[PDB]
Ligand code: HEM
């Protein structure tokens with residue numbers, strides 16, 4: 562089992578969601594704490610997790626939060642502490658999620674699977690792990706998005722790279 566030395570990830574959540582949040586209906590915004598933003602993707606930086614290079618499994622852990630607001634404060638969604646977990650060419654995108662419903666009532670989703678990952682590329686070696694995966698919204702994620710997306714909705718893809726060490 563190898564430790565994660567430095568990891569980075571890029572994920573836009575969903576391009577059409579970014580456009581909706583900033584557009585004339587939601588009339589909203591996002592703020593970021595420990596997360597960047599560039600080329601329509603949120604930017605994550607972490608130094609924890611572990612990878613099994615022989616079995617091609619692992620977890621890559623990131624700190625930081627994205628906070629979406631809109632609809633006069635009725636929309637209020639936080640996604641924090643994302644984790645990319647993988648076992649072979651499939652995995653899970655896990656995060657701490659809190660989101661308000663269309664009545665303005667906040668619901669805490671715990672540390673939940675936000676989406677299922679299917680890797681189109683995944684390389685794991687002694688010194689590096691990297692890959693790209695489609696992200697399919699989970700049932701809990703659908704509820705957090707106020708049912709505007711069905712479970713199984715394809716979100717933006719997620720990519721990551723990590724240097725590994727410390728066996
Ligand atoms: C008074 C409250 C709200 C009203 C009136 C409202 C209205 C709308 C309308 C008219 C649309 C576009 C039509 C559609 O895609 O079905 C939309 C899209 C959407 N709304 Fe809001 N909404 C509200 C609150 C919320 C909340 C609390 C969330 C939770 C995250 C949310 C998430 C979404 C999503 C995910 C979409 C789809 C955006 C896309 O990717 O195209 N909405 N909403």
Ligand code: NA
Nearest residue numbers: 565566608609
């Ligand atoms: Na580490």
Ligand code: NA
Nearest residue numbers: 619620646647
């Ligand atoms: Na894992």
